[PDB]
Design a protein around this ligand. Structure first.
Ligand SMILES: Nc1cccc(C(=O)O)c1O
Ligand SMILES: [Fe+2]
Ligand SMILES: [Fe+2]
Length: 174
């Protein structure tokens, strides 16, 4: 049986869910309980956290523009996601997506993580570049498992404190 339903028009789905593709929500998963996690992410959203995904991530920037702050080969880099761009990110490449434009929409496709395969979320010092805090997580649900992780970081000056130069990470903003 067609567990995930029949085909449907994508642009229409996006327009009908436009109020969810903006703060405070920002994103929407298309299908529930599937092996492929298919999400549409909108904007605006800026963030400071870097994601360490143990599996690949596919991006297709449908509307608007965005960029990914990355660490590549020990250096900070940027991959620009201009409207119409596609991109495949290898596992473990640290990335922090920035989505400045309202009304933007990006297709992001991931896989469910098997038991034991953990996601990491990291923050780095604006001053010296050292890792400030890393949390690893078994990701079952984005909505429940993720926000409190970000919240405890922002609320603790200890977690935000660089172990190399003592500068305290700004937390939420930058
Ligand atoms: N962490 C993460 C995983 C998959 C997609 C995004 C996105 O907002 O581009 C993201 O920020
Ligand atoms: Fe990610
Ligand atoms: Fe530092």
């Amino acid at each position: 049986m067609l567990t995930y339903g029949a085909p449907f028009n994508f642009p229409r789905w996006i327009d009908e869910h436009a109020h969810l593709l903006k703060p405070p929500v920002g994103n929407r998963q298309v299908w529930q309980d599937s092996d492929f996690i298919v999400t549409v992410v909108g904007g605006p959203n800026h963030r400071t956290d870097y994601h360490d995904d143990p599996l690949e991530e596919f991006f297709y920037q449908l509307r608007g523009n965005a960029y990914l702050n990355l660490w590549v080969d020990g250096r900070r880099e940027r991959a620009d996601l201009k409207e119409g761009d596609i991109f495949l990110l290898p596992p473990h490449v640290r990335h922090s997506p920035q989505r400045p434009e309202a009304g933007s929409a990006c297709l992001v496709i991931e896989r469910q993580r098997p038991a034991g395969m953990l996601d990491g979320f990291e923050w780095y010092c604006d001053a010296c570049g050292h890792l400030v805090h890393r949390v690893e997580v078994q990701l079952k649900s984005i909505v429940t498992d993720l926000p409190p992780l970000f919240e405890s970081f922002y609320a603790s000056e200890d977690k935000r404190r660089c172990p190399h130069c003592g500068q305290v990470h700004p937390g939420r903003a930058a």
